[PDB]
Write a protein that binds this ligand. Structure first.
Ligand SMILES: Nc1ncnc2c1ncn2[C@@H]1O[C@H](COP(=O)(O)OP(=O)(O)O)[C@@H](O)[C@H]1O
Length: 261
């Protein structure tokens, strides 16, 4: 299955701590989408597909939505694993309907979450089981090498497991840009903290700088959760405003939850 969102609502001012990878996408998919005739006359060939790596909850989906919003393209999220049907032609079939729908509601960004589900290189020619998943993988590449000219429909792939990937896919004329989207540094965390606390009622004791410092290697999704946990501590103590203290308890909770070793 695929989840469709015609006009997503994600703006770049809301994606923290990815200044460079944000710019790279902007110019490597947004710009081509906006100005195909320009890319044409200037000379350079834009990517048909771009691939995003790194941990889960880092903002990969986010960026894609963000591009989809800045371009009023139909956002199309494809759940990688959900394409692993164990029946003849069933996987490939869904890929077809997905491109059918991407063109029908073009412009559109197809963001495929976890393509390593489909595009993992197996182990060898004792394929059996994942011979069918190969039938699907081939279907995708067909659609790609296929319809694609410049930019009316763009494809973004995402994985947190890039060396499992099949070189076949990384070939030019497919996913040839591969951007890392990493857990953010300290500087990064703070921006993300500023974004998610932007609509909440913070007490004047709340040193955000401090909490960014407290959250070694959390991801944007985990930080988002911290903000909504801190608020709930306030609610729990029937308040109206969120305290430096609340956050220390949120951080503390989420960091242990993270230590699932
Ligand atoms: N860099 C970030 N900036 C702002 N919000 C983020 C960031 N990373 C994660 N989030 C929050 O967590 C959610 C999950 O991000 P998403 O892009 O879906 O994760 P993934 O990188 O796995 O695609 C986002 O909707 C956003 O609210």
């Amino acid at each position: 299955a695929m989840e469709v969102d015609e006009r997503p609502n994600v703006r770049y001012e809301d994606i923290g701590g990815l200044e460079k990878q944000m710019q790279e996408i902007r110019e490597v998919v947004e710009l081509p989408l906006k100005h195909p005739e320009l890319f044409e006359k200037v000379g350079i060939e834009p990517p048909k597909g771009i691939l995003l790596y790194g941990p889960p909850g880092t903002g990969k989906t986010l960026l894609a939505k963000a591009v989809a919003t800045e371009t009023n393209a139909t956002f199309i999220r494809v759940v990688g694993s959900e394409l692993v049907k164990k029946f003849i032609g069933e996987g490939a079939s869904l890929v077809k309907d997905i491109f059918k729908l991407a063109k029908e509601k073009a412009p559109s960004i197809i963001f495929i979450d976890e393509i390593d589900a489909i595009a993992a290189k197996r182990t060898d020619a004792l394929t059996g089981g994942d011979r069918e998943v190969q039938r699907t993988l081939m279907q995708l590449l067909a659609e790609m090498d296929g319809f694609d000219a410049r930019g009316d429909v763009k494809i973004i792939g995402a994985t947190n497991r890039p060396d499992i990937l099949d070189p076949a896919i990384l070939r030019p004329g497919r996913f040839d840009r591969i951007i890392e989207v990493p857990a953010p540094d300290e500087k990064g965390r703070l921006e993300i903290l500023k974004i998610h606390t932007r609509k909440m009622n913070l007490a004047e004791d709340v040193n955000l700088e401090e909490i960014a410092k407290m959250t070694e290697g959390c991801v944007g999704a985990e930080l988002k959760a911290i903000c909504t946990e801190a608020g709930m501590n306030a609610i729990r103590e029937l308040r109206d405003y969120v305290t430096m203290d609340d956050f220390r308890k949120a951080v503390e909770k989420i960091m242990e939850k993270k230590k699932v070793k």
